[PDB]
């Protein structure tokens, strides 16, 4: 929560704890629907894993447009100081 690097490493840590994503393909600019091949509900439980990690209620309109871990770490950086 202090620097952006810890946030990005923690995002990738939660996404490799997530089991339906194969971590070998998991890059920071990897997409979930067309690259990793996920359902929408997979991305929804990814966002709820992010709320289990970071601890702030993410609305629906700005979590729909979180289609890569880079967008996730950029949105957490927008909602924080860094």
């Amino acid at each position: 929560p202090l620097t952006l690097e810890g946030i990005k490493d923690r995002v990738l840590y939660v996404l490799k704890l997530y089991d339906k994503i194969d971590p070998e393909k998991l890059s920071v600019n990897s997409h979930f629907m067309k690259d990793l091949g996920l359902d929408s509900l997979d991305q929804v439980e990814i966002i709820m894993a992010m709320e289990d990690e970071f601890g702030f209620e993410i609305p629906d309109i700005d979590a729909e447009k979180l289609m890569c871990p880079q967008e996730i770490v950029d949105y957490i950086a927008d909602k924080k100081d860094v």
């Binding site: 359902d39 929408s40 509900l41 929804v44 709820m48 629906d60």
Partner: protein, 114 residues
């Protein structure tokens, strides 16, 4: 073709409501396993919730998925409040039923149903 909505103007608000309902079920399942003292894992109940959501995944009518969100919130209120019992929650897990014959050959062997 000019019909009156229930909650959703189109499929975007409808998918928003389906998404919020799946969020609420995903948050609810560990409490449902705990205080009903169900003998299933939390992943197993979450996969049952994913199966019950993917069962209705072919609907393209906003009014029908509005009613599905409505009935899902009703079942969620029956699950948060202890109004269901262990039987009503485990009825989504068809466990006493036999695996029905799937191919043509075993359905031919057991009976007359197509």
């Amino acid at each position: 073709t000019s019909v009156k909505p229930i909650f959703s103007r189109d499929m975007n608000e409808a998918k928003r409501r389906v998404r919020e309902l799946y969020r609420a079920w995903y948050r609810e399942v560990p409490n449902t396993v705990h205080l009903f003292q169900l003998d299933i894992s939390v992943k197993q109940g979450r996969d049952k919730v994913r199966e019950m959501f993917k069962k209705n995944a072919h609907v393209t009518d906003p009014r029908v998925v509005d009613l599905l969100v409505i009935k899902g919130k009703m079942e969620l209120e029956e699950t948060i409040n202890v109004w269901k019992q262990r039987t009503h929650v485990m009825r989504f897990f068809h466990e006493t039923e036999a695996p029905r014959p799937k191919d043509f050959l075993s359905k031919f062997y057991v009976g007359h149903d197509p």
